[PDB]
Amino acid sequence: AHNGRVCSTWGDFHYKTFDGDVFRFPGLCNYVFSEHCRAAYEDFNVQLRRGLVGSRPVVTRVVIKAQGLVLEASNGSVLINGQREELPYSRTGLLVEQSGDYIKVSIRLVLTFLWNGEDSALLELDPKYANQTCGLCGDFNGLPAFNEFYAHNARLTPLQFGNLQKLDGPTEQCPDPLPLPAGNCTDEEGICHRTLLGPAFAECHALVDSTAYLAACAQDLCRCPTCPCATFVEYSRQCAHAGGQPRNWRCPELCPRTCPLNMQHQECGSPCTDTCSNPQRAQLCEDHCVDGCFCPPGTVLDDITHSGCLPLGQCPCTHGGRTY
Amino acid sequence: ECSHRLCLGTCVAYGDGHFITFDGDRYSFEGSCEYILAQDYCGDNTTHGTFRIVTENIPCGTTGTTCSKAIKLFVESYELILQEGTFKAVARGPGGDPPYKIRYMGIFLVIETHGMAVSWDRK
């Protein structure tokens, strides 16, 4: 599956490259989050801008440039080639949607960009882009620990590394984040260890190592204590992307989620929600676990009038745009 | 007086979206998402059916007018993605021998399944 063709950015400036690295980088300018830069002609150029909401680390603007298409996501709005568009916007090879809790831009055979809207942002790239990319997401050569941080045979700190992949505005001179002093807190109550090493992500321990995620959970605990679940969410996403089946870890106290009356909030639900417009879409799907709202088995979704998930034999039909 | 050999039905999906279905009907449809070009997975029982073919319009250098296609030849538990000029294999189910065969027929990728032969001009 999507073994090592994924990079991510979450929570308190935590960056995860394709090959498995994790590092914190508290930058606050525009950065080349990834880019086709070892090719005669570039295919994609995805950039991030990270900012502050009062104190919360967020992503304020993404600019994906791909094959002559410019896509600027910011302020809860999407600009397609300079024009605002209403979601979803679809064209040959491109589709952008408000699917689930996020904004997902899939440029078929190029990339898959999920953006939760505030802090998370995840890139899936084609296997043919190996070794030809460069940016915070790394080089996609498959070797994590050895080739991202050697600038002319010298090893760099994540602050320096993230500062190399910097890009100022035409009239902007953004500074660099001075190193954060030592940390504190750690996991005193054991919440990170109890959850991450708990039952839910059992098989996730067999695919993705949790050490960096444990550290990030502790570091977020040092930050506000309503925002420690970002690392758990990211670990769920990564475990789902490697191939393993994450299990439900959310409890009414552990960052509770809500879904509509007939829709349940699941970790690892089938991405293709069967809906009696196409009540058998979920037959031979190929896509890993995805989190979001889902329907209890048997009662497919009703996308024709949006009455929630409905039994197969009580949902409407459509003829010529007329509901029956 | 003609020999009574059966002749293979033919569907043609080409160009900016012209289709000539099996029954000889012709029409034009400019779709951008993934469209089921064929399947046996439609019936009072979907599960006694075997194959499934989806296509969608790839632009090869931009996001504009179509330049090529992307085929998804499912056969039972196998799978074959046809894009970008050649084929792949994402076989996920039971790992037996291929129920398909692959051949380079002139300027075509031809994939047979002993009763169902798909020819793709590679564009």
Ligand SMILES: *[C@@H]1O[C@H](CO)[C@@H](O)[C@H](O)[C@H]1NC(C)=O
């Ligand atoms: C987003 O855009 C709206 C207008 O569409 C504006 O009122 C608001 O201040 C912007 N920012 C946020 C964080 O909502």
Ligand SMILES: *[C@@H]1O[C@H](CO)[C@@H](O)[C@H](O)[C@H]1NC(C)=O
């Ligand atoms: C990846 O790129 C580096 C850069 O020179 C090269 O030395 C190496 O052989 C490449 N390996 C693969 C598998 O592409």
Ligand SMILES: *[C@@H]1O[C@H](CO)[C@@H](O)[C@H](O)[C@H]1NC(C)=O
């Ligand atoms: C096929 O569908 C019918 C209802 O149309 C059902 O009674 C029968 O059990 C199904 N057979 C199989 C093998 O699923």
Ligand SMILES: [Ca+2]
């Ligand atoms: Ca590397």
